[PDB]
Amino acid sequence: AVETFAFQAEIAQLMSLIINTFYSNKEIFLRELISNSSDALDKIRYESLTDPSKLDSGKELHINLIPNKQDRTLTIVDTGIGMTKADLINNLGTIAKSGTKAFMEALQAGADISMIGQFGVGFYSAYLVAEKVTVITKHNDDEQYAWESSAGGSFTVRTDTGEPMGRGTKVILHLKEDQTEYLEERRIKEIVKKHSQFIGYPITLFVE
Ligand SMILES: CN(Cc1ccco1)C(=O)c1cc(-c2n[nH]c(=O)n2-c2ccccc2F)c(O)cc1O
């Protein structure tokens, strides 16, 4: 049921740098995840213009932010296009290669970690605040999958046996013990207002 994969070497190196570099401006992770969700929503909306049946798995196009102080998790849910098994295992990592290599050269040349998004590898900034990331996804052309990594050079993929989601992606950030400020309603609002006022889909913050 569970398959284990090695990350592409350059991605493993980037994740180690993100985990081991002293860097205080950690809030940039939320902008990057919301941006990816917005891109996934644009993709399904676009495909639905030539094939309306693409929305049979759900018409609502939105992003939900769900902090959970008890489990110490921050969940980002979207009803975008989702990802196939091939996306999770190889295809997204393949397209990220040049950006990953360029970003690491930029960091060696004195660039700031906040520039990560300009290199298309913004997702990995989640490892500034998360000890583990679980991703539950469902694409119209494939089954529901659960991807997971605590970094350390590998990730896993399994078919998800949990509640079916219809379509989209759920990113569950298992936060580090000293990063619980990202579970506070006022902190999430401050970040979203500062880094995300040009997203064309409703972002709803779930109150505990
Ligand atoms: C969950 N991850 C990290 C990861 C671990 C394994 C594979 O990806 C993400 O980056 C991520 C991906 C999507 C997504 N669904 N469909 C699709 O095309 N994308 C996508 C959109 C913009 C850039 C890249 C993308 F893939 C999303 O909606 C939210 C996300 O936070």
Author numbering: 16 to 223
Copy out sentences from the published article reporting this entry, exactly as the authors wrote them.
Here we report the investigation of the role of protein flexibility in the modulation of binding kinetics and equilibrium thermodynamics of drug binding to heat shock protein 90 (HSP90). HSP90 is one of the most abundant proteins in the cytoplasm of eukaryotic cells, comprising 2–5% of cytosolic protein under non-stressed conditions. It is a ubiquitous molecular chaperone intimately involved in a variety of pathways, including cell signaling, proliferation and survival, and protein folding. The N-terminal domain of HSP90 (N-HSP90) contains the nucleotide-binding site, which has been the target site for drugs interfering with ATP binding and ATPase activity. The unbound N-HSP90 has a highly flexible lid segment comprising residues 107–14137.
For 7 of the 20 compounds, it was possible to obtain crystal structures of the complexes bound to N-HSP90 with loop-in and helical (8, 14, 16, 18, and 20) conformations of the α3-helix region (loop- and helix-binders, respectively). The main difference between the structures is the conformation of residues 104–111, which can adopt either helical or loop-in conformations. In complexes with compounds whose R1 substituent exceeds one atom (compounds 8, 14, 16, 18, and 20), these residues have the helical conformation with an adjacent hydrophobic pocket lined by the side chains of M98, L107, F138, Y139, V150, and W162. Steric clashes between the ligands and residues 105–107 would prohibit these complexes from existing in a loop-in conformation. All ligands occupy the ADP-binding site and form typical interactions, which include hydrogen bonds of the 2-hydroxyl group of the resorcinol ring with the side chain of D93 and with a water molecule that generally mediates interactions with G97. In contrast, for the helix-binding compounds, there is a large favorable entropic contribution to binding, and most of them have a binding enthalpy penalty. This switch in thermodynamic profile is thus directly related to the conformation of the α-helix3 region with compensating differences in enthalpy and entropy of about 60 kJ mol−1 between loop-in and helix-binders. Protein flexibility is another possible contributor to favorable binding entropy. As previously mentioned, the N-HSP90 crystal structures show higher B-factors for residues 103–111 in the helical conformation, suggesting greater structural flexibility of this region compared to the loop-in conformation. In the helical structures, however, the Q23-N106 interaction is not possible due to the binding site rearrangement, and this may contribute to enhanced flexibility of the helical conformation of the α-helix3 region. on can vary significantly, indicating transition state destabilization playing a role in prolongation of residence time. Helix-binders reach up to 230-fold slower association rates, when compared to loop-binders, indicating a higher transition state energy barrier for helix-binders, as depicted in the right-hand panel of Fig. 6.
